[PDB]
Structure formats: structure tokens, C-alpha cells
Ligand binder design. Sequence first.
Ligand SMILES: [Mn+2]
Length: 693
Amino acid sequence: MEAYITEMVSRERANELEVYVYVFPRNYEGVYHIMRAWQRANDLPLAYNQHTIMAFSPVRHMCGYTPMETQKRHINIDSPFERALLERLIKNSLIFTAERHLHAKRVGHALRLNQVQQIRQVIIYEAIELYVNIIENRISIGFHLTHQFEYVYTLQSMIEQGKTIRPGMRVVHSNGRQHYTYSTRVIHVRTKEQRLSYAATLLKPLCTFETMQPQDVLNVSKCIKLSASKRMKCTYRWIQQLRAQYRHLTFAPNPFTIAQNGYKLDQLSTPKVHFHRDYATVVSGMKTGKLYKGGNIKISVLFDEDFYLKHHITKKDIYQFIAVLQKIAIAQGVNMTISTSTKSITGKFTDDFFHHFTEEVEALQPIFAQTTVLAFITSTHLSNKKTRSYQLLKQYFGGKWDIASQVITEKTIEAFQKILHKHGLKNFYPNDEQHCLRVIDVLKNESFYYTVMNILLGVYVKSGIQPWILANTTHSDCFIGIDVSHENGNSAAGMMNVIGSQGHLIQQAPLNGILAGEKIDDTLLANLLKQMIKAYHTQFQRFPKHITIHRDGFWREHTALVEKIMSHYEITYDIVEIIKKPNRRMAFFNSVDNTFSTRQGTVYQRGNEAFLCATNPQQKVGMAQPIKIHQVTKTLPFSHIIEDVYNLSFLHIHAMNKMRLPATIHYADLSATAYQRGQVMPRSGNQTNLPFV
DNA sequence: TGAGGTAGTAGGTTGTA
DNA sequence: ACAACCTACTACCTC
Ligand SMILES: [Mn+2]
């Protein structure tokens, strides 16, 4: 069983290629018109960069643009400029070959291929993206397969068959090259703000899951979810065909294996989790084990009347469900008690309450103070506009009053009641220990258990409970997570603390996540590092030895500040970049049955960059997405950092379902989103605090 | 919004002799 | 302008 990556490397080197270089007199969009006219006249693969143009063959038709210098020169490998220009020229040459010999259309950002299937007047188009990099005087080409949607009809087809042009109808200028989103008739829809009009014979409605009909959506989504074998066979077939007509570079007969690409293979193993002993899996420990750090939780109930008015379910059913939750929690060493403050607000929370939420909620703070709200709001009120129950609920409770809250809708309660009816229950549940035990016992064999436990986990983590930690220690003693999000000109920073080599404190940094600009200032980073050091010293009574910073995306911060700061306290550190969507794919090919598969905890390593497989999705779900790890600094071996990254992904204490990313980046992204929408507020403390999810 | 996974749509932020 | 990220939204399936 061999290991395959979606890449290849060129036998020729960056300094073994003869190129023609034309330099024009002395703006990053320069000499683009000259290059386009040159392409139009001399029909050759050409590329530009700033004010220089490079090709593989001499240019005959000058088109009146006289160059300053002409050369048959090689490239200075030490100059990144000429490396980028050669990469652009190779990319353009590949695109030109595909267009001339394989009939592909460069649309948007990808080369659209032939259609694969039409689903009731919906065309599905294959597409591929190409990338060229120069890695230590070697040329690596990577590629990624994807899909595109289309409606096969213009506006004329509908307008001939009656219908009405809606002001809010979504149409695009479906054509070649660029694409824009805005009885002859004229439509004057704005592109973004500029006024445009057309003949309505070429504008076509957009094909998106938002607007497609439910019958088409199922099949279209089913089509774009292929297995690993089909996906990578399709990816490799077209690239082999492209190779068969390319002459400017040559490759090995089988250039897709990791051996040809200079990668080394690592097989990580699943860790163990600690609840009160050592458990192989999280599910086994949570099923029949006591929590790592239990305690006492106060819960308050928010019940709206429509939940009974339009759905024939009573508040007594809600209290039976809550009693079941309480008994399950007490079975694991967690004591939850219902507050009795729900007496002055009996019968409240009607439709008028939801329609005047912004004015009839200020008096609810003393009712739910120092508790955990378990809200049972209707999904219609949460989702439908002019009410915005979820947004206002979060933005008030967690946004301003720092009160944790967990929301449940009618689908969960109807599923619970349907299971009860199936099992012969609903006669009487609350205040009956034997009936509660029977309900808990029958909950085990159903998948709905994962729902119930998830709810409990959501209550636990927001209440200061630490469900489990790592059984074994890691090579780093301290983990920091940083993420940045930009929405509508507003920048939100998410910061995250993991205090201890076993986990042992998953916490959010008590710092404001709203940035005055688009960049993280030096003061914020200094405060984050110093506060995390203080937190570790408080928790363990000793200073840490090593700290690893995880960054989502690319490191755009001041490294000199980080070392000035941790030179004084004398802790070694690393800076690591975690990249989602690397636009590559990993597999193991088995030639006995000719199948591509994936194995969780697989690592491909090259230099200071690695690809990690952290999930095991099912065939109908799709194919696993690799993560990209990049080590900026060189304090410890790359293997140890990859191990820490893989091990921190098993600390998803908010759910029973395994998550792809480590907690450091996952929870930091969630926190950045929460500050983007203004639904969280800093809270100092020393316990497990995740006031989101 | 029980949670996670993955895969389409349209836009936004960098930094580049 | 180009390249390599990021975000939001929708959808489905799995537990
Ligand atoms: Mn949640």
C-alpha cells in the first residue's frame, strides 16, 4: 500500500531552462496590455511581472512596444522575483496547452472541463486548479479538482414562457473568462453599485444551494460528494492527459507518490484520555466513567408559551426532560439543581415578548443571575426576521450580562417524545426514580443519546466543568492560540489558552477581542503572553519550560517582540502555522483492489512543512481534508510539534464527535466569531471556560 | 440553534526586485 | 495584477 499526494516534481531544474526575457522601461499592473497584445499577435505562452516579460520562444510581432533589453539568459535562483516569474510562465504554459489541446475554459479561478452530469436542467462541470512553486531549485506542480454549477437556460427562455422579472432575482453574466454577479426587455440591476443594463439574452440565474429547488438540491449535493477513489482517479486522469501533450517539462512515469516528491511518512497513534482512570476512547470514558473535575451547577429554565401553543407539548414534559438530564449528570458526579426564581416570571415569554424582546428583557437579569439558562425558544422565533430570538438572546445574556445559555428547539423535543412513545414511556417520568432510570436505560441504545450527552457537555463546559484531560504528557507545557477575522471592515481577534501538557485547563484569554485596526498590536501580544505565563504559574506553582504558539493562517506578527518578551522569563518557544484548506489531498493506494483510502493520524513531512490527516469521514460524507503544519522556528524537532498538534485535537470537551482541528485553533476561531457578533465578554477565572459553542 | 464532518456559492486581506 | 490564504452562506450525512 503506497502513499500518494496530489503533486509532482519536475526532473528539470530552475536553472536548466532556457528562457527569453524582455525588459521595458520603468505599479504592480504594468506591461499587462503589452503582454496581452503580444499573446494576441504571436499566440505564445507568455508571462509578466512588474515591468519584465518572460517567454520560452522568441517573439516576432513587436506590436509597436519596443523593449529596452532582450536576453536569452537563465534566471538568478537567489532572486525570488525571477522565480515567481518563471512559476507564472509555467502556469501560463500549462493553461495554454490545456486550452489548445484539451478544450478547457479558464473560468473564474479554475479551468472548466467537460460536463459530468445534468440533474433536471442543472449542469455540473468539472474544474481543476494548478499551482507552481520553486522549492530549492526544483519545480513542484500541485493541482486540485473541484466542481461548478450551471443552469442551462437564459432569461429569454423564462420570459417567453410568461413569468415575472423579480427585483430580487439573482442572475449573473455567464460568459467566458471573468464572471460577474449583479419581446426584448432591459434589466437595470446594479453590479455592486454601478448601474448596468443588458439585453437579457445572456444573463442567467445563479446556481447556488440557497436558490435551487429541493428536488434538485438532493441530487446535486449527492453528485459533488464522491469517494476518495473516484475523486483522485478523476484528478490523476486529466493531469496525465495534460502531461501527454506538454513538452517544456518532463516527469517520472509515476510522479504522484510521496517518494518522488521527497516526502517522509509518519503513522501517529491514538492517545488515551483520563476521567478518573485511563480510557482508550472519549465515548467509552463518557459512557461509564466519572468526570475529571465535577462540581455543582445551577440551571434556570426559560420557557416560551408558543412552544406549547403551536406544538402540543407541555411544560411538564420539559421538566421531565430536565429531570432526566439531572439524573444522568448525577450519575457522573455532577450536581445540577433547578433554581426557584422562575416564580415571578410564570406565564411570560409569549409572542408579544419575542416581538418586543429589545424592550421587555432588561428586567430578566436578576431572575437568571449566577445560573445557566436552558432556553427552549422556538426555531421560528430564532430564525425568522423581525424577531431574531437567537441573536438578541446571545447579544444580551452573554454579550452584556455574562450569563451562559444553551438553546434547544422543538425538533429535539419532538424526537425525544417520539422515542418515549415508541418505548412505551410518557406515562410519568419526573419525580419517579424508577421511571427516570428506565428512560435513561432506553436512551442508551438510541443515537439520540449523543444529542442528550452533547447538551450536557454544553452545560458542563459553560459551567466550569473539565470533562477529561490527556492521559499522557506532551513535549510542550503551554499552548497559545491566535486567530483573526475580518467582516465588514471590523477585525476580531480570538485568543486561546491551554495550560498544561495534559490539557488540564482549556480557557479563553481574558482579553478584549475587538481590534482598533486590522492588525494585532504589540501590546495585545505582550499582554497575551504575560497573562498566559501568569496563569500557568498560578495553576502549577512553577514557571513553564516551553510554549508553542499556534496561528491560524500566516504569521503576520512581530517575532522580535515575542523573543524580547520570553527572553526575560527564559522560556523556550515555537511559532507554528496551521493551515486549513491546503488545496491538496492525501491517500494510500492499494494495488490489490486498485483503491484509494485514507488513514487517520497520517503525516507527510518535507523540510519544515507537513500534511496531517486528522479525520476519518464516511464515504457518503466525502473525503478527509488534510491540515498543513508549518514550523517557523527551530527549537524542537518537527515530529514533536506534529505530535502535539495531533494530540490537542482529542480535547473536544464540548462534544462527543471528533473534530479535525486542535482545540487551540478551533476554539480560537469560535471565539473570534463570537466577538465579531458581540456575543461574549471577558471573564477572569481559573476554571474551564468556553462561553460559546 | 445537540454536535461534528465535507463541498458548492460569492467576496475580502495581504504582500510582491 | 497575481497568488495564497481567509470569511460568510447554503446544502447534505453521521453520531
Ligand atoms: Mn452549542
